[PDB]
């Protein structure tokens, strides 16, 4: 019964961390995906200004949105994915020792 309560507690936690991982990967797609078109929208009006110290900054600001896009999206893959692999690894391992328990029964 001790073991049952304790390892049921880890599993619930591990299951909760898993549905967080799914949301966290999903919600990097936009702003990142949005800013990939924010960059083109700004860049577009930057062909319309030609006056050097407004054209120049505006193209840099465009570039800035692309920068935000590249980093924000990369972070699904950086961090969330590292955790999703080890979270998944644990749930299986917990499954497997559920079999060892059964063997004892």
């Amino acid at each position: 019964h001790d073991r049952r309560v304790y390892l049921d507690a880890l599993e619930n936690q591990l299951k909760a961390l898993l549905k967080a991982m799914d949301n966290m990967v999903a919600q990097r797609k936009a702003m990142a995906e949005a800013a990939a078109d924010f960059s083109a929208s700004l860049h577009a009006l930057s062909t319309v200004e030609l006056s050097p110290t407004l054209s120049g900054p505006l193209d840099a600001l465009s570039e800035l949105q692309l920068a935000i896009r590249d980093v924000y999206e990369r972070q699904a893959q950086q961090d969330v994915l590292t955790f999703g692999i080890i979270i998944e690894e644990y749930i299986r391992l917990i499954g497997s020792v559920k079999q060892a328990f059964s063997q004892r029964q």
Binding site: E49, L54, L58, L61, L64
Partner: peptide, 13 residues
């Protein structure tokens, strides 16, 4: 107006 507006949007950001 455009030219002012964009300059502000940078200062804002």
């Amino acid at each position: 107006e455009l030219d002012r507006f964009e300059r502000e949007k940078v200062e804002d950001f």
